[PDB]
Write a protein that binds this DNA or RNA. Structure first.
Ligand SMILES: Nc1nc2c(ncn2[C@@H]2O[C@H](COP(=O)(O)CP(=O)(O)OP(=O)(O)O)[C@@H](O)[C@H]2O)c(=O)[nH]1
Ligand SMILES: Nc1nc2c(ncn2[C@@H]2O[C@H](COP(=O)(O)CP(=O)(O)OP(=O)(O)O)[C@@H](O)[C@H]2O)c(=O)[nH]1
Ligand SMILES: O=P([O-])(O)O
Ligand SMILES: [Mn+2]
Ligand SMILES: [Mn+2]
Length: 1095
DNA sequence: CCAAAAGAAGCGGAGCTTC
């Protein structure tokens, strides 16, 4: 413990004494940090970090010497050096702003004078930066080493933070704003996704600052300072960036949206550099100079990423040896630029790519306001992908003369749901634009004979890219569908691309050519197909055609099928056998493929099946209210409105209802995963209203083209046969909107009753400003809920099985109950430590606990089995980071604003998270992990969770391996894993110790509704043990089912497209049998196995 | 439903208050 002397030698003039027990001013920087055993940052010890790093950046030679390396990134050239010189000068500006901000803080309310007189201002929420100041005559000044290093971190954050932010969707924006997800105004999601919240901005900035300071946290120092000091620095730097206009602050007033929402929420947006800024070609020079082991960098050639030790954002969970092996395998894969696609993108240019793939140039007077905001968001995503691709390309271009031969590696980590996530927002796994320019897939094909297997592979890739659903038809049938398309509608586009691949030029009408040819087949991968086919046509040597074109093996209705296989717990039923076949589990059909199943046996997948069951439930609901004309009319109007605007709903002339799989796809999925019906109703309404607002733009565009067009032809001209037709479609719309907003169904004692809202929609429609307001949205949702979603939910249960639903319920309940106890006990042990600390004269409220103290509290939870283990994966369902544990501000800026809450890694309630955690984890997660690590693991692939892109040379074997990996995952038993954790929990939990809040939360899960009011401790303890019994029985059933299934002849084609099924070679032959016969035989084998347990 | 949380700001020196 010579760590006190060490850090004092480096920072001898900081104000105060590095002694927690001292009477006067105590220095909490020196008390909180220590010098590392091995250098982490090259700025430690530097008198002037900004000067030193600026010199290092001033030339290649100086950079190489400072970094103690032989050769710098070749992207670090003259133009880039000049830009960094200018950026360093800007660093001086930020430093100067910070110094003045400190001066102002010291002067205001005499804080500096009081601090000098012994007022412990350095322990205030806004004064923690006084721990990094030094006496300066009658005042104080920043330690220059710490300030300048922090500014360097600030500059790196400014350059690359935006590219590393998370994506905000509707759920995220609802949590942030506190506005019900279904009622979010159009473009609010887009507004919030483009900016950072205060916590988002400060936490990322603070991480950078602490990293560059290059020290280690003292485990016996309070988090109020270890986390507090760098956060305080970050808050000041964010404030400085607002002053400099590097960051724009927008305080968004929620009361303008919902008058009873008091929240005012800060959004921070970094000012974007020019797309042509040379700094874009190497944006991490600072990072790679300051840090001995940089995080932010590209991995070129044989520079490979390290393997992460812990689960993403879950430091309590180590990646298992098998997970680390999978990560290593994926990080080993080489990606390469496909020059033709880069040149194609480049030649079209950003504007034309936006026109083709986004919304083009928006003119805000032919657009409905709400629709205009969605179109803005669509442009943003495409533009950001384009810009990010070309920044990467500029860096790749510097590495070699031939960009197509520069290997690129990507870092991955395991998420909390066991998926291998490629890090970054704009990479091949996450961004479709990028996916068609940077690829690991490569093959040299013999395309000289259209009868070759190589040519068949080529065709499969092209067809899939062109939106032919290749898994639904045999290879032979696919081939003919592709040929017709290539020689038909696509031919003018192919001709254009042939010319491009000859002269390098595109015509002025290139966008129109592609649009007209592709129609609804338009996608980035479709562009790759047109490119590659045209390249083949002009190829000199068709016998050795080199292409990155791929085939994606993708899981057919993957999550739902995995749940059905992994968690169905009773005896076998013929309906389950038929339905699981829809997912590619074929019993008694050696070598059967999904392609054959779809073409000869059953053309309806699981989602289509549930749609059919919805149609039955709907009929039953109508019969229950046959004599009720108001109810019948209300149902009619809902279905009418959906028919008007949604592609997956169709009503025939005589009233015949037709539904496509698309309406059930997400609802079925998220229902299994614990979604309420209300949320689904909200999403369906949003899809309807999206289409309405778009149709309103179609109106404004029709009126501009023709001022004497009728409202009926302006809104329904493109949709109608004649004009009288457009008139009856318009009448429908107005009638539907009136009744669906003025009247709502309410359930009263199991009966639906119509009620007047009093807030019905009436008035002339102004297509420009037209917006369906909150109360009217609520009414649409209520109609959608009771007349569509409830029937759909009934259909869902019928399709996936009541047995599965039961398993998922018990899983949810157990994991929720456990998480409630974990959360409450953590909080109680925290409050108990804080009551002790309140006796410590060295401790002040706002100082929190130490890391050791928190580590001890987490370790004390271990007899409650917080972790779920499978043998190859670890899940921590309760793991979170939240502000509710410390319930206090961590730091503010020096203006008493930017008040960052103190967030702590702690267990929190799971809610329904246990279901998707376990289903995604032991399903697609385990499948991919197995694919990366199994004997003969396919090489040169890109994995996208339940889909895998395969090079054309290896489509057969890699597909068969994928199906084998499915079979391997289907040997799992997530319920058994949950049970083993819950069983340990149950023998160590003391329900009497729980707070009243925790006991109430467990009551909801463990008890029937008529039990919460009067709940005793012993009642809910008894109820919790009952769930343990339920889990044990389900787990036993699953085990038997898997064992029995393994004995039988199986052909598995869940990872479909190629027609390469995995055969388990089970010896019991169930061929030439109905599902009823099969179920009987399987159940005989079940009982036989069940009687083997007994004895 | 899940894969990441997440109000601001005066006065005063924490945390109540009001918007
Ligand atoms: N918890 C959630 N999981 C989702 C959601 N969307 C997709 N997924 C998961 O990813 C899985 C694969 O998604 P895909 O895009 O391939 C669609 P899916 O496989 O369900 O059916 P196909 O259309 O046959 O591919 C899916 O089955 C779910 O387990 C979602 O909104 N929430
Ligand atoms: N857990 C979740 N996974 C998702 C969700 N959305 C997408 N995904 C996963 O990411 C994969 C890619 O999603 P995309 O947006 O590209 C939809 P697409 O049909 O184009 O994907 P493919 O299945 O690869 O054809 C998807 O298949 C799922 O496996 C989600 O909301 N939750
Ligand atoms: O093109 P699909 O059939 O693999 O989705
Ligand atoms: Mn899928
Ligand atoms: Mn997929």
């Amino acid at each position: 413990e010579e760590l006190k002397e060490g850090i004092d030698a480096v920072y001898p003039s900081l104000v105060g004494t590095a002694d927690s027990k001292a009477e006067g001013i105590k220095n909490y920087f020196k008390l909180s940090f220590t010098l590392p055993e091995e250098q982490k940052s090259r700025t430690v010890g530097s008198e002037a970090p900004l000067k030193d790093v600026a010199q290092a950046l001033s030339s290649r030679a100086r950079y190489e010497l400072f970094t103690e390396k032989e050769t710098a990134n070749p992207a670090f050239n003259g133009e880039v050096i000049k830009r960094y010189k200018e950026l360093m000068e800007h660093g001086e500006g930020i430093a100067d702003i910070l110094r003045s901000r400190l001066a102002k803080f010291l002067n205001t309310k005499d804080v500096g004078k009081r601090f000098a007189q012994g007022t412990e201002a350095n322990r205030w929420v806004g004064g923690k930066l006084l721990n990094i100041v030094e006496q300066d005559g009658d005042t104080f000044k920043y330690n220059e080493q710490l300030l300048q290093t922090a500014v360097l971190a600030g500059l790196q954050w400014r350059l690359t933070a935006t590219s590393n932010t998370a994506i905000k969707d509707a759920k995220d924006v609802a949590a942030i704003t506190g506005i019900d997800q279904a009622l979010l105004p159009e473009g609010l999601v887009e507004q919030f996704d483009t900016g950072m919240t205060l916590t988002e901005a400060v936490s990322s900035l603070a991480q950078k600052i602490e990293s560059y300071w290059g020290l280690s946290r003292n485990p016996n120092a309070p988090l109020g300072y270890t986390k507090g000091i760098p956060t305080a620095m970050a808050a000041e730097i964010l404030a400085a960036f607002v002053e400099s206009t590097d960051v724009v602050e927008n305080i968004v007033d929620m009361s303008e949206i919902d008058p009873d929402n008091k929240k005012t929420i800060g959004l921070y947006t970094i000012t974007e550099l020019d797309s042509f800024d040379p700094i874009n070609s190497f944006p991490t020079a600072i990072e790679e100079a300051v840090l001995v082991n940089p995080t932010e960098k590209m991995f070129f050639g044989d520079d490979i990423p390290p393997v992460a030790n812990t689960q993403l954002r879950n430091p309590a969970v180590r990646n298992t040896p098998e997970q680390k092996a999978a990560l290593k395998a994926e990080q080993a894969t080489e990606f390469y630029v496909h020059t033709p696609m880069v040149q194609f993108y480049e030649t079209l240019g950003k504007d034309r790519i936006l026109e083709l793939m986004g919304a083009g140039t928006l003119n805000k007077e032919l657009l409905n306001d709400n629709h205009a905001k969605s179109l803005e968001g669509k442009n943003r995503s495409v533009e950001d992908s384009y810009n990010q691709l070309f920044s990467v390309i500029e860096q790749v271009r510097a590495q070699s003369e031939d960009i197509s031969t520069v290997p690129i590696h990507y870092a991955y980590n395991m998420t909390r749901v066991g998926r291998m996530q490629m890090l970054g927002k704009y990479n091949p796994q996450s961004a479709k634009l990028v996916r068609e320019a940077i690829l690991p897939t490569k093959a040299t094909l013999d395309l000289s004979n259209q009868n070759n297997e190589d040519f068949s592979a080529f065709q499969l890739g092209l067809a899939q890219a062109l939106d032919i659903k290749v898994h639904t038809m045999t290879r032979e049938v696919m081939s003919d569908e592709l040929t017709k398309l290539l020689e038909g509608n696509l031919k003018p586009a192919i001709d254009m691309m042939v010319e491009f691949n000859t002269t390098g030029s595109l015509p002025e009408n290139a966008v129109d050519v592609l649009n007209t040819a592709l129609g609804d087949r338009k996608s980035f991968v479709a562009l790759m197909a047109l490119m590659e086919y045209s390249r083949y046509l002009v190829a000199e040597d068709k016998s050795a055609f080199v292409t990155p074109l791929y085939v994606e093996a993708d899981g057919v209705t993957n999550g739902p099928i995995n749940a059905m296989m992994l968690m169905t717990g009773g005896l076998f039923t013929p309906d389950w056998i038929r339905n699981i076949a829809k997912g590619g589990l074929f019993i008694g059909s050696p070598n059967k493929t999904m392609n054959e199943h779809r073409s000869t046996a059953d053309n309806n997948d699981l989602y289509q099946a549930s749609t059919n069951a919805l149609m039955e439930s709907l009929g039953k609901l109508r019969s229950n209210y046959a004599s009720n004309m108001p109810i019948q009319s209300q149902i009619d109007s809902l279905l009418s409105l959906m028919d008007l605007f949604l592609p997956d709903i169709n009503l025939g002339e005589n009233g015949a209802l037709e539904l496509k799989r698309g309406i059930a796809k997400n609802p079925l999925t998220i229902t299994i995963y614990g979604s309420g019906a209300r949320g689904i109703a909200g999403k369906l309404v949003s899809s309807v209203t999206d289409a309405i607002y778009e149709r309103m733009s179609d109106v404004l565009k029709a009126r501009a083209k023709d001022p004497n067009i009728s409202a009926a032809m302006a809104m329904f001209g493109k949709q109608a046969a004649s004009e009288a037709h457009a008139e009856e479609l318009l009448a429908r719309f107005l009638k539907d909107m009136e009744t669906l907003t003025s009247t709502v169904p309410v359930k009263r004692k199991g009966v639906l009753e119509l009620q007047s809202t009093g807030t019905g929609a009436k008035g002339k429609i102004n297509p420009k400003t037209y917006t369906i307001k909150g109360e009217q949205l609520k009414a649409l949702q209520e109609n959608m809920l009771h007349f569509f979603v409830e029937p759909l939910r009934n259909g869902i249960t019928q399709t996936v099985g009541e047995s599965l639903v039961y398993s998922t319920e018990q899983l949810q309940k157990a994991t929720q109950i456990q998480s409630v106890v974990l959360e409450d006990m953590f909080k109680q042990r925290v409050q108990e430590k804080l009551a002790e600390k309140a006796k410590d004269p060295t401790w002040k409220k706002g100082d929190f606990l130490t890391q050791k103290e928190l580590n001890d509290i987490q370790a004390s939870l271990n007899n409650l089995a917080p972790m779920i283990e499978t043998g190859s994966q670890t899940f921590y369902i309760a793991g979170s980071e939240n502000a509710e544990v410390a319930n206090q501000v961590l730091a503010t800026n020096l203006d008493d604003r930017m008040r960052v809450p103190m967030s702590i890694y702690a267990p929190a309630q799971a809610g329904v998270a246990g279901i998707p955690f376990m289903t995604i984890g032991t399903g697609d997660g385990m499948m991919m992990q197995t694919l990366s690590t199994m004997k003969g693991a396919p090489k040169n692939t890109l994995k996208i969770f339940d889909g895998m892109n395969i090079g054309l040379n290896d489509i057969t074997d890699a597909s068969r391996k994928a199906n084998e990996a499915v079979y391997t995952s289907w040997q799992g038993n997530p319920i058994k894993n949950v049970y083993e954790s819950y069983a340990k929990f149950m023998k160590n939990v003391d329900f009497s110790k729980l707070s009243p809040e925790a006991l109430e939360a467990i009551g909801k899960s463990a008890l029937e509704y008529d039990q919460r009011e009067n709940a005793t401790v012993d009642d809910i303890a008894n109820a919790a043990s009952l769930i343990e019994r339920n889990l044990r029985n389900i787990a036993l059933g699953v085990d038997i089912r898997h064992k029995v299934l393994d004995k039988v002849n199986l052909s598995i084609d869940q990872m479909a497209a190629v027609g390469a099924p995995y055969q388990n070679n089970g010896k019991i032959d169930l061929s030439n049998m109905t599902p009823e016969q099969q179920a009987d035989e399987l159940n005989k084998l079940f009982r036989e196995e069940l009687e083997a347990r007994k004895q």
